[PDB]
């Protein structure tokens, strides 16, 4: 009989779904052929970037003394990190709002 | 009859979240943003990997096109870490076959 099936995610040590990522690469008309390491590498990168945002957003949620990440916390996480802000520079996060920012000339004189 | 089966990254974002912050939850609206983010970044990398194969007359997208696409798309130190994570996963997977 065949061996007990292991997910490719498990072999890669990933949470993100290598098998689904491979199907999406094959179905997405990106190339005639998709190499076996391509979905493993891509799934690892997508997982890493997901963890990077969720860490910063979970900190922002905790700073607001809230247990759930909401869109506000994702916006605060992205806009306060220089590199994620550059990656997501043209992205609008719905219900995110804006960073608190008042130009110094607008503040009242002492 | 139940509604048509629609795939999402939601379960994987949650599994990553509980590694990063085991006591933190996420709202349904925030999860929809995270699902949009993963789909967006996927299409950016797969799109640039597609062009790299085309410019070099390759039929195949490999981990090497993915690695170069990551070095093109991600800024700065975010690229350095992502390339490391991708290389580590492919190394482990290859040892496990």
């Amino acid at each position: 009989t065949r061996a007990k099936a292991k997910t490719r995610s498990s072999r890669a040590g990933l949470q993100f779904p290598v098998g689904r990522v491979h199907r999406l690469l094959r179905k997405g008309n990106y190339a005639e052929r998709v190499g076996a390491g391509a979905p493993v590498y891509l799934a690892a990168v997508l997982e890493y970037l997901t963890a990077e945002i969720l860490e910063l957003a979970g900190n922002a949620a905790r700073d607001n003394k809230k247990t759930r990440i909401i869109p506000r916390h994702l916006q605060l996480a992205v806009r306060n990190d220089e590199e994620l802000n550059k990656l997501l520079g043209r992205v609008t996060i719905a219900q995110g709002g804006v960073l608190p920012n008042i130009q110094s000339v607008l503040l009242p004189k002492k | 009859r139940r509604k048509t089966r629609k795939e999402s990254y939601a379960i994987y974002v949650y599994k990553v979240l509980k590694q990063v912050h085991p006591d933190t939850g996420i709202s349904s609206k925030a999860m929809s943003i995270m699902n949009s983010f993963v789909n967006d970044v996927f299409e950016r990398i797969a799109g640039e990997a597609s062009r790299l194969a085309h410019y070099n007359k390759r039929s195949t997208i490999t981990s090497r096109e993915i690695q170069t696409a990551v070095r093109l798309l991600l800024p700065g130190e975010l690229a350095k870490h992502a390339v490391s994570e991708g290389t580590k996963a492919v190394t482990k997977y290859t040892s496990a076959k």
């Binding site: 890493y48 963890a51 990077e52 860490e55 | 990063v20 130190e77 975010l78 870490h81």
Partner: peptide
Amino acid sequence: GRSL
């Protein structure tokens, strides 16, 4: 700093 930058995450794992």
